[PDB]
Every structure is written in C-alpha cells, then in structure tokens.
Amino acid sequence: TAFVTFPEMFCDWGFALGGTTGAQSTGTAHTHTLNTDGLAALQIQILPA
C-alpha cells in the first residue's frame, strides 16, 4: 500500500529506442539508425543548497 507521483516502474527501468533520426545540423546529410543501445528513461537533476 503506497502512493507515488508516477509509477515506480519508470524509476526502476527504461525503454529501448528504435527508428531513425532526422536531418543533421551541419555537414553531409544523413540519418542515423536507432537501436537498443538508446535508453529512454527519467533524468537526474542536480540541486544546490
């Protein structure tokens, strides 16, 4: 029994990326291929006193 601001499964795990990106900022035009090496999850925020 508990209450959480958002499910703890996100805090414990992540998602594997997939697909293909878009255009680049500069240089030769190309698109990279996504794979399981990319992880989508929550971030960490630093905070001073």
């Binding site: 209450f3 959480v4 601001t5 958002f6 499910p7």
Partner: protein, 49 residues
Amino acid sequence: SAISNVIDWFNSLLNFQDTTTSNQINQQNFQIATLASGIKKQQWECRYS
C-alpha cells in the same frame, strides 16, 4: 411475581427490538456509504478524482 417477571421480559424484548433495529439501520447505511466511497484515481492516472 409472575406479572413482574412478564414486565421484565417485555422490557428486555423491547430493548432487544430497538437495538436490533438500530443495528440494522447502521449496517445498511455503512454498507451504502462504503459502496458510494472507495478507490479513487491517483493524480498521475487522471486529473479528476
């Protein structure tokens, strides 16, 4: 003594009668209230309760 005992038994029966009626009303109202209230959706699942 016989009439006194009958008086006492009738008073006991009336006490049992009122207690049972009050208990029935309380139990039914408690069940109705429990059914009306209960689980509510958390903040993240939806905005409204």
